[PDB]
Design a protein around this ligand. Structure first.
Ligand SMILES: O=C1CCCN1c1cccc(NS(=O)(=O)c2cc(Br)ccc2Br)c1
Length: 127
């Protein structure tokens, strides 16, 4: 039933960088998905209490959301692009794991993920 602490967005002893790929992940990828009409369910951690989903964090053991990704990018939390790409993929995968095909939230994730794929196809070469 209860919500877990959200994923961390700050960790001072975690090494981090600001690469051109991570800049693109913020300025292009996150920005594109964030403004989308279907972004809102994904702009913050799942509130299992308010949404009345008491089994959500029994099923989903690696939660992720764009609110978290946004703060991680703004805070330069990542070492490399792959870490951030993995967070997006975790977010999408969690949605598909928890819900059933054709649910509204799945259609919404599919729309965002199509755009995600189109943008990472154009990920720049590093440096
Ligand atoms: O799986 C995820 C990841 C992000 C939110 N989420 C999720 C899954 C199941 C229900 C809800 N509750 S909700 O946000 O009010 C909702 C949203 C939409 Br769109 C359609 C119906 C409902 Br009910 C949320």
């Amino acid at each position: 039933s209860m919500n877990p602490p959200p994923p961390e967005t700050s960790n001072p002893n975690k090494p981090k960088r600001q690469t051109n790929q991570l800049q693109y992940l913020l300025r292009v990828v996150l920005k594109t998905l964030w403004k989308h009409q279907f972004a809102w369910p994904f702009q913050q951690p799942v509130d299992a209490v308010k949404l009345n989903l008491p089994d959500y964090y029994k099923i989903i053991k690696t939660p992720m959301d764009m609110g978290t990704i946004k703060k991680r990018l703004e805070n330069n939390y990542y070492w490399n692009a792959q870490e951030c790409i993995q967070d997006f993929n975790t977010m999408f995968t969690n949605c598909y794991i928890y819900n059933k095909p054709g649910d509204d939230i799945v259609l919404m994730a599919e729309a965002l993920e199509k755009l995600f794929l189109q943008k990472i196809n154009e990920l720049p070469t590093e440096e």
